[PDB]
Amino acid sequence: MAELTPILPFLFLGNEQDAQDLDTMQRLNIGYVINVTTHLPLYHYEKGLFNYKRLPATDSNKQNLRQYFEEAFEFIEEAHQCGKGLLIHCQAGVSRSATIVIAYLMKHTRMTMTDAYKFVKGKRPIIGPNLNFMGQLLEFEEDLNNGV
Numbered sequence: 001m002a003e004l005t006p007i008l009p010f011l012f013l014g015n016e017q018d019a020q021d022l023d024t025m026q027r028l029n030i031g032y033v034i035n036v037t038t039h040l041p042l043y044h045y046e047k048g049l050f051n052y053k054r055l056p057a058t059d060s061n062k063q064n065l066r067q068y069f070e071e072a073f074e075f076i077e078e079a080h081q082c083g084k085g086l087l088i089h090c091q092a093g094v095s096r097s098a099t100i101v102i103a104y105l106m107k108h109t110r111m112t113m114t115d116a117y118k119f120v121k122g123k124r125p126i127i128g129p130n131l132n133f134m135g136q137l138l139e140f141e142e143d144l145n146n147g148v
């Protein structure tokens, strides 16, 4: 159907349809999945093939995603330290997951917010705006710069 975008060598971004292609996940050495939704299934759980973390969030104007940054950053590096890839997904438009990737690219690549967004948008061209998440990523940049 569709293709889950490599952002880093171990970090992939996709929507809900991308996360249901089991064969591409096995092909890419994916062993970790972050599902940034409250309501979807963890798509291949009963198969016993992957480590999962759910971030139960909505694509809304009131949703806090900063709370999950540090928890999500650990799961990404555990996949890195163990040499397996990680897929982080939500749904079409990937607003919630892209926020998390962008936060990771700021914290662990010392990119600026806007340059991290430009980077992600280059590899993954359709990303729905959400000003609430933007404001969170701005206040995360400042906290990261002024001693987080």
Ligand SMILES: CSc1scc2c1-c1nc(SCC(=O)C(C)(C)C)ncc1CC2
Pocket: 094, 095, 096, 098, 099, 102, 113, 114, 117, 127, 128, 129, 130, 131, 133, 134, 137
């Ligand atoms: C980190 S976003 C960012 S930083 C500087 C700009 C932007 C931007 N992003 C988007 S879409 C993506 C989003 O809004 C997120 C869901 C990831 C928060 N549309 C317009 C703009 C204006 C320029």
